[PDB]
Design a protein around this ligand. Structure first.
Ligand SMILES: [Zn+2]
Lengths: 181, 241, 111, 49, 49, 49, 107, 99, 94, 173, 50
RNA sequence: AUCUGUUUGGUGGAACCUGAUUAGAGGAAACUCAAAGAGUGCUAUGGUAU
């Protein structure tokens, strides 16, 4: 629509064809762009998990502070998330409500972890390599760019043995050994 | 400093139609409409361009007050290429010729003068510059030459009279366009020698606001001139608020 | 296939939605394609909003509003499994119904 | 005391030139251009608000 | 009304019926529009209709 | 629209009177003329244009 | 033109750094990146300025650099100043280091 | 200047690999080809070198001058800031003595 | 300066190297020593960082620039001095 | 041929022009007045032009000090009082209680200055005028305004205190 | 304090914390009414006063 | 010169630190297709309609 004149704007203050309140600020698209998610419902599946963690954290909070059950379950929930890598630190219990976010789960996706491990220059580039079958976690080749890598599994992410990518790395350093391949 | 055979680098000024000639010294220069001659003996710069030989004229701030305005850094000049300008108080071609240079062949200048002895010289310079309309008539009575002036994009007034505030208003009402420019050169001795310079400038600005001219800026012309200031304003007929 | 077709109110533009998820918006007289989406989902129906610039598509579980070029603008979370779409042009109201048996009116202008 | 105030004043005149321009009689001799150069992108001008 | 108006003692119309002249005891004579939403400019035929 | 365009005040005549205005007379033959008087004893003739 | 004749290039490089040409001038502060449209011109004096502000043809040169080096005072000044800077820049450098290691040798 | 050991140099990440340039010893054909304008132009190539050397040193000295007066001035200001700070505390004790 | 004589603020002249040791060089003073200590620590600080970067290097790091770039048999990077001529180009040059 | 890493097209808030937030997106150094020799205003000479602030008229009535006499007594010179339209607007705006102030403020000796800015805030108007022209004395008792005028160099500042006016930054006294 | 559970424990803690804050914390910042649109809030106040 | 080694310009851009940006950054073509912004031109003329 053309830029509204002064008198039209006053009579049409709330009209917005491109931003609605139910969109929640397009937090959907923004997080998808940063981490290059391809399935439009992957954010909302992550969100529903984040909500359930937050629901339990509240229900634990309302329980009395000295209760052994409260302390036990909260510690278990902190360790589990930290092991997954969603939570960077296990110290403060407020992190369950403040620092549990969809972006936290997204950052553990295989495309991003390669980018942090510098196996790729960019997230978009790293996604292409997964779809090309160059990336393995352990001895299993992975073509799904939504593989959530736990902290312990992050050590086993590596190129495939015969990948052309692996040959360029060794060739660039003049360390290519053709017996291995 | 700027001797005869010395070479210089000509580059454009921030204001359109004005150029700077760099070197050991910097000179404000405007392109010559009538090449091969000087109107008041200024230095000229000749440039070969593909080849035709273009010529430039040096603009001396100590002789023309408008040039002193450029040197001090006036933010806005409504004198620009392709704009009609009404020059009141055109004693001779010392400054009108330079104003004629800036507007270009497309624009025009209406030079208004009262005394006849300089008028004869103003006509003589005018013949060399086709885009100058010389009006040898009293600027206090704009009606006498209404046939000879159309709409003008800006009004420049260098008239040295105590009642210049009335001269600027009457000419602006008849000929200046809405949202048009007004540039005035004020000499405090001429208006009121009894009182200090600042009061006259403050007093003069008030008259312009009364006359529906919104003052945008005032600049003092030192060190080139003492007791002078150039006030640039916009003629806001609709409202000054 | 199969394909569901809805013309614009003034008849200048055509919107076809394949069942397997092929949505195309075009100007059929001059043979100009405005947008073509290959959503890998089950599309049921689509309609033009106030003009050809925007159109709505009833996908598997949510209705989506799209731009003239095919860029998504909103995901209507409140509309669930809409199977029929209609637009009241003067009221700027979008209407939906489906397996939930809920009739939902949505104001395009205010959202 | 007189000598010290003489030198204090002449020193003050020098500083005033740095703060602002001061009229110094105008032009002396042929106009040789602006010795210290022209700045295209600076306005020393006072704007009404 | 206006906070600067203090006691209306005289009210009159312009002879064209478009304006109101008011005189208070504060010492000012004010001008008002007879119809606040109307404007005095000549309107194009499309405006008028 | 009528409300947000309702701008009745247009202005005031000059600087007004020293004391309150108690007598206003309009010229019934001329549109833009007015005569006013104040308790100070002064009477003025205005050009409303 | 893209040819950017070296005579023209040196002229503009001699105006970006004009503050150092003469030790008594001390111009204002400005940057002067090379403009994308400029021209080179020669001043033409008035006939009334024959004695005051006119240059002799033998002194006239096609380029500013030609006239500047033609001067003898400035040419002398740069030789003095440039040599002084070299002494400042060459103090304590490799040549100095070798001497200190040479004295430690008995001869 | 620092000389990185080759063992550390060899095993460096691609982003941080120091570019060390080896000197050329076999004369390149282009090096044997290029023509150098001598005589008059030599006098016009030294001179520009002489001018630029003065201009840098002049700027590099004036820049050091600004940093010298920058230090003395801020020391003067921090004293003024200290006076306005302690006196600010005094006023807020006198005021809240009333309240 | 308050309650201080000018005699109190007298420059203490600073000595020179002995003649017997004159071969070795200039007797360093505290200001001279400070320049050495800072210089060594500045280099050592960077050299420590480079060693740490070597230790944490990921062998699998891949950058598309690896194709254009080349390395030495010693393992050090090779970089072109200015950054081959076809026969047609050579014929014109000759 | 198909491209890899295909993603659904969606509205990009940060870079889309149509959205309002993205749609929206010669240095000047004012000359130091030639009328000022460091901190001494050489241009100001008798008779003086004085700008009246709204508080000044009220406090003048408080102490039974006539505007013309109090000035002409304080500076030993003819003073030309000036009341701007903003100051008059504020006085009218005060209400019936301050009607005495309005009638004195309209004394014909007190000249009037037209103004060309929408707001009626007088403090800003006076501060702008003194900055442009260094030819006015500011007559005010407001604490906020006086401190602003003090920072501006060479602006004599007049106030009403005790039994008569007081002038601060005017050497000729 | 050990027995109390549910909303009462959440409301109890907030009431205690505010009370301690009022002594030293500035009135503007300690207590901030939640943002509600114009038309709604007059509705809530009018009914509540009723 | 198996002399010397500072400076100017060009090539290259390790570490630290700072700033901005981020589905990495660009480039070329046009009687191509769209969505917007600014200015300008045109008797642009029913105050109550032959
Ligand atoms: Zn005002």
């Amino acid at each position: 629509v053309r830029k509204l004149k002064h008198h039209e704007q006053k009579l049409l203050k709330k009209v917005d064809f491109l931003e609605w309140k139910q969109d929640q600020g397009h937090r959907d698209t923004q997080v998808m762009r940063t981490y290059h998610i391809q399935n439009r419902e992957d954010y909302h599946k992550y969100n529903r998990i984040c909500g359930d963690i937050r629901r339990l954290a509240n229900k634990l909070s309302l329980l009395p502070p000295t209760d052994p059950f409260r302390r036990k379950h909260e510690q278990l929930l902190l360790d589990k998330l930290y092991a997954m890598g969603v939570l960077t630190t296990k110290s403060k219990i407020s992190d369950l409500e403040n620092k549990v976010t969809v972006s936290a789960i997204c950052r553990r996706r295989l495309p991003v972890i390669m980018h942090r491990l510098k196996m790729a220059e960019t997230i978009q580039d790293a996604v292409k390599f997964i779809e090309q079958g160059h990336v393995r976690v352990g001895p299993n080749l992975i073509n799904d760019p939504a593989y959530l890598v736990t902290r312990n599994m992050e050590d086993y992410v590596t190129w495939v043995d015969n990948s052309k990518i692996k040959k360029t790395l060794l060739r660039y350093r003049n360390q290519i050994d053709d017996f291995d391949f | 400093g700027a001797r005869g055979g010395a070479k210089v680098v000509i580059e454009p000024h921030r204001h359109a139609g004005v150029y700077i000639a760099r070197g050991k010294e910097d000179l404000l220069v405007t392109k010559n409409m009538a090449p091969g001659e000087s109107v008041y003996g200024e230095k000229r710069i000749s440039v070969e361009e593909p080849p035709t030989k273009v010529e430039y004229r040096v603009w001396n701030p100590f002789r023309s007050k408008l040039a002193a305005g450029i040197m001090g850094g006036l933010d806005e000049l409504f004198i620009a290429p392709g704009k009609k300008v009404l020059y009141l108080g055109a004693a001779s071609g010392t400054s009108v010729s330079h104003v004629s240079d800036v507007v270009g062949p497309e624009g025009v200048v209406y030079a208004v003068e009262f005394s006849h002895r300089p008028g004869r010289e103003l006509i003589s310079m005018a013949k060399k510059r086709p885009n100058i309309i010389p009006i040898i008539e009293d600027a206090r009575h704009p009606q006498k030459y209404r046939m000879l002036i159309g709409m003008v994009d800006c009004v420049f007034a260098d008239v040295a009279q105590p009642d210049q505030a009335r001269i600027i208003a009457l000419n602006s009402h008849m000929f200046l366009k809405d949202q048009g420019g007004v540039v005035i050169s004020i000499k405090a001795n001429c208006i009121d020698s009894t009182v200090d310079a600042e009061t006259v400038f403050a007093r003069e600005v008030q008259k312009l606001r009364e006359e529906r001219i919104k003052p945008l800026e005032q600049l003092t012309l030192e060190p080139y001139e003492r007791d002078h200031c150039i006030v640039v304003g916009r003629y806001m007929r609709s409202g000054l608020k | 296939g199969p394909y569901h077709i809805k013309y614009a109110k003034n008849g200048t533009h055509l919107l076809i939605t394949g069942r397997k998820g092929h949505v195309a918006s075009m100007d059929w007289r001059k043979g100009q394609l405005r947008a073509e989406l290959f959503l890998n989902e089950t599309c049921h129906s689509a309609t033009y909003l106030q003009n050809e610039q925007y159109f709505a598509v009833a996908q598997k579980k949510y209705t989506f509003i799209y731009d003239h070029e095919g860029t998504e603008l909103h995901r209507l979370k409140q509309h669930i499994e809409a199977r029929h779409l209609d637009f009241l042009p003067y009221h700027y109201l979008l209407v939906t119904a489906g397996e939930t048996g809920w009739l939902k009116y949505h104001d395009v202008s205010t959202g | 005391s007189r000598v010290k105030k003489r030198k204090k004043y002449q020193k003050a005149q020098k500083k005033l030139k740095s703060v602002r321009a001061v009229y110094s009689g105008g032009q002396s001799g042929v106009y040789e251009g602006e010795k210290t150069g022209i700045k295209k992108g600076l306005t020393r001008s006072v704007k009404f608000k | 009304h206006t906070k600067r108006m203090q006691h209306v003692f005289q009210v009159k119309y312009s002879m064209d019926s478009k304006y109101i002249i008011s005189g208070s005891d504060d010492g000012n004579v004010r001008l008002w529009r007879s119809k606040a939403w109307e404007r005095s400019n000549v309107k194009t035929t499309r405006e008028k209709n | 629209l009528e409300r947000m365009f309702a701008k009745p005040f247009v202005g005031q005549l000059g600087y007004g009177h020293r004391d309150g205005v108690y007598a206003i007379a309009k010229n019934y033959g001329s549109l833009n003329k007015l005569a006013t008087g104040s308790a100070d004893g002064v009477i003025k003739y205005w050009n409303m244009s | 033109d893209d040819n950017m004749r070296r005579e023209v290039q040196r002229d503009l490089l001699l105006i970006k750094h004009r503050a150092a040409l003469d030790p008594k001038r001390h111009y204002k502060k400005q940057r002067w990146e090379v403009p994308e449209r400029f021209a080179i011109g020669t001043i033409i004096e008035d006939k009334s300025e024959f004695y005051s502000s006119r240059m002799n043809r033998k002194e006239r040169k096609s380029t500013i650099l030609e006239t500047l080096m033609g001067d003898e005072a400035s040419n002398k000044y740069f030789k003095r100043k440039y040599n002084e800077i070299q002494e400042k820049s060459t103090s304590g450098r490799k040549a100095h280091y070798k001497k200190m290691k040479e004295m430690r040798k008995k001869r | 200047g620092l000389k990185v050991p080759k063992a550390v140099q060899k095993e460096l990440p691609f982003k941080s690999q120091i570019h060390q340039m080896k000197p050329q010893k076999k004369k390149t054909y282009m090096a044997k080809r290029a023509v150098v304008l001598g005589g008059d132009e030599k006098k016009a190539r030294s001179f520009i070198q002489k001018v630029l050397t003065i201009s840098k040193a002049k700027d590099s000295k004036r820049k050091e001058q600004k940093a010298s007066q920058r230090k003395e001035r801020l020391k003067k200001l921090a004293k003024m800031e200290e006076e306005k700070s302690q006196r600010d505390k005094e006023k807020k004790k006198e005021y809240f003595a009333q309240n | 300066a308050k309650l201080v004589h000018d005699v109190q603020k007298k420059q203490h002249r600073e000595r020179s190297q002995l003649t017997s040791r004159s071969r070795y060089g200039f007797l360093e003073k505290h200001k001279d020593y400070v320049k050495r200590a800072q210089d060594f620590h500045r280099k050592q600080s960077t050299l420590k960082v480079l060693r740490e970067k070597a230790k944490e290097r990921n062998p699998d790091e891949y950058y598309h620039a690896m194709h254009s770039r080349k390395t030495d048999a010693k393992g050090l990077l090779i970089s072109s001095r200015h950054g081959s001529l076809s026969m047609d180009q050579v014929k014109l040059l000759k | 041929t198909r491209k890899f890493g295909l993603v659904k097209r969606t509205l990009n808030t940060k870079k889309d022009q149509r959205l309002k937030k993205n749609q929206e997106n010669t240095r000047n150094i004012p000359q130091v007045s030639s009328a000022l020799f460091f901190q001494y205003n050489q241009a100001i000479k008798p008779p003086y032009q004085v700008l009246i602030d709204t508080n000044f008229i009220n406090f003048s009535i408080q102490k039974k000090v006539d505007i013309v006499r109090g000035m002409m007594d304080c500076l030993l010179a003819k003073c030309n009082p000036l009341i701007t339209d903003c100051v008059m607007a504020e006085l009218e705006k005060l209400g019936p209680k301050y009607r005495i102030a309005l009638k004195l403020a309209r004394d014909p000796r007190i000249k009037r200055l037209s103004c060309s800015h929408k707001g009626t805030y007088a403090d800003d108007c006076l501060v702008h005028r003194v900055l442009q022209h260094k030819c006015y004395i500011v007559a005010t008792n407001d604490a906020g305004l006086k401190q602003r005028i003090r920072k501006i160099p060479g602006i004599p500042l007049m106030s009403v205190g005790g039994h008569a006016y007081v002038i601060e930054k005017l050497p000729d006294v | 304090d050990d027995q109390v559970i549910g909303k009462a424990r959440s409301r109890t803690l907030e009431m205690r914390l505010n009370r301690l804050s009022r002594v030293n914390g500035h009135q503007d910042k300690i207590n901030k009414l939640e943002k509600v649109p114009m038309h709604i809030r007059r509705g809530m106040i009018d009914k509540h006063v009723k």
